[PDB]
Amino acid sequence: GSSGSSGQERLKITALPLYFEGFLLIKRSGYREYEHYWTELRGTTLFFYTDKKSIIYVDKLDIVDLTCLTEQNSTEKNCAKFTLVLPKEEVQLKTENTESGEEWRGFILTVTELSVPQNVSLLPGQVIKLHEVLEREKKRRIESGPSSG
């Protein structure tokens, strides 16, 4: 119907540093049909949302222990389709166009390999992100290990 409120909610720092954003399609055994959700790339955890307004992500994933990334030819549409190989379970991912794909894929490979893929098609203005995003997660490396047990 409608909502009402008096105040501005514009924070800069929340929990994890933002790297990328765009409507991503999630697919996992059972889904059957790629799900739509405002996916957000942060640190090394994929956060799925429903709307920018939403503060609490409807659901989130994890690709920190990513084992690798596969590609699916899929002769039909020229898009980027890869599967997130995890040491626990695999998950399907999809974008809107090849562009976004290369973006995520790259961005991910960056927030997974702890480096930057030089085998992409992105530009010098996009690659930077990969570099930045990297250095961004790099710091994380600082306090990551298990502090005592």
Taking the CA atoms of residue 62, residue 57, residue 96 and residue 103 in that order, the dihedral angle to the nearest 10 degrees is: -50
CB 59 within 8 A of CB 72: no
Q: Going by DSSP bridges, is the β-strand pair 18-27/81-85 parallel, antiparallel, or unpaired?
A: unpaired
Give Cβ neighbours of residue 121 (< 8 Å, ≥ 6 apart).
Answer: 102
Cα Rg, the chain, nearest whole Å: 16
- Compute the residue count for the chain: 149
Written as six digits, the tokens of 130 are 């990969």
CB 56 within 8 A of CB 45: no
Location of structure tokens 């390999």: 113
Distance CA 131, CA 55 (A): 27
Distance CA 35, CA 25 (A): 5
Q: Does domain 1-149 have CATH number 3.40.50.720?
A: no
Q: Going by DSSP bridges, is the β-strand pair 68-71/35-42 parallel, antiparallel, or unpaired?
A: unpaired
Q: Going by DSSP bridges, is the β-strand pair 91-94/59-60 parallel, antiparallel, or unpaired?
A: unpaired
Nearest alpha carbon to residue 19 among 87, 116, 91: 116
Sheet holding 91-94, edge to edge: 59-60, 45-49, 35-42, 18-27, 91-94, 81-85, 68-71
Location of structure tokens 């502090």: 147
